[PDB]
Design a protein around this ligand. Structure first.
Ligand SMILES: COc1cc(CN2CCc3c(cc(Cn4ccnc4C)cc3-c3cn(C)nc3C(F)(F)F)C2=O)cc(OC)c1
Length: 305
């Protein structure tokens, strides 16, 4: 494929404040969304059909993530907690307490016995899913933590922060294995491992995304053309068809790049505020996007490649 042809199929209205994060369930059936309105919503991944609302946090929610079997969700809230939810019943199974400021980002490990979180309190915490207890507190950064992600076998965690650092952590020991910097130390607004686990995709608040080989510390690709100077915006590897990079943008568009050539191959227009979050369906060429307070809708876009 040379270029995709993503076209708007559904617009998902229901949150009453900015949408903070959207994620597809690993089994492809569902989309979960979190919002500053303190709610989680569940939507059909293929038809946009509203499914249910999950409530219980006392303040807005920044992030949600799915367990590997698609049965559990974890949410990260301004109330300083994370919550583990059984999706099909809606019950809160555990409340994870320990952070001393907003919890901004979260993820399960692939085995989904652990949760990693990053907080405005500048720490990363590793939690046991079964007991809800904090296993490790990492003195990870000197500014809020903008992203945390496990690699494909769960042995590593990558974190990013406004302090301009990206760090790689040994899940088992909690030891910092690598600190990665970039010229002029722009805030690092997002990071995540590539699906094969060999690369790091990192956003910096200088309107730039970079694909890094973190082992050799070498920048392999640079993607520009979007607007990213103010917000932490999710980015993705799209792998079900053509190999793309996907990101939101502060000009209200979804950007899609060719991973190897770095050329913009499509811009998706429709949102009326910053596109803060995008996600890529695990098996079909479907993108979900979500926007800030002046918009508050989620959109599902479908491509033939
Ligand atoms: C002190 O300076 C700062 C400023 C900022 C700015 N900041 C704060 C608000 C915010 C931001 C990014 C994302 C997207 N997101 C979430 C998890 N991972 C990602 C990529 C969601 C939200 C958010 C949370 N809630 C409850 N409502 C929202 C919404 F904006 F949608 F209203 C964001 O950029 C961040 C920061 O440290 C991290 C330090």
């Amino acid at each position: 494929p040379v270029k995709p042809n993503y076209a708007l199929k559904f617009t998902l209205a229901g949150h009453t404040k900015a949408v903070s994060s959207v994620k597809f369930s690993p089994n492809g059936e569902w989309l979960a969304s979190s919002s500053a309105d303190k709610l989680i919503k569940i939507w059909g991944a293929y038809d946009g059909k509203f499914e249910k609302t999950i409530s219980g946090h006392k303040l807005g929610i920044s992030d949600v993530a799915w367990s590997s079997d698609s049965n559990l969700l974890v949410s990260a809230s301004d109330d300083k907690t994370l919550k583990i939810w059984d999706v099909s019943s809606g019950k809160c199974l555990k409340t994870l307490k320990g952070h001393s400021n907003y919890v901004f980002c979260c993820n399960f490990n692939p085995q989904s016995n652990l949760i990693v979180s990053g907080s405005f309190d500048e720490s990363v915490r590793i939690w046991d899913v079964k007991t809800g207890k904090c296993l490790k507190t990492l003195p990870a950064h000197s500014d809020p933590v903008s992203a945390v992600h496990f690699n494909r076998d769960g042995s590593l965690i990558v974190s990013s922060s406004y302090d301009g650092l990206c760090r790689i952590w040994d899940t088992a020991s909690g030891q910092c294995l690598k600190t990665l910097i970039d010229d002029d130390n722009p805030p690092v607004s997002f990071v995540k491992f590539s699906p094969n686990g060999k690369y790091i995709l990192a956003a910096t608040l200088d309107n730039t995304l970079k694909l890094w080989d973190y082992s050799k510390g070498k920048c392999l690709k640079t993607y520009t053309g979007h607007k990213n100077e103010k917000y932490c915006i999710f980015a993705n590897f799209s792998v079900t068809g053509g190999k793309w990079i996907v990101s939101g943008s502060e000009d209200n568009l979804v950007y899609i790049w060719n991973l190897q050539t770095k050329e913009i191959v499509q811009k998706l227009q429709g949102h009326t505020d910053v596109v803060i979050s995008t996600a890529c369906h695990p098996t079909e060429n479907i993108i979900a996007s979500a926007a800030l307070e002046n918009d508050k809708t989620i959109k599902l876009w479908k491509s033939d490649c």
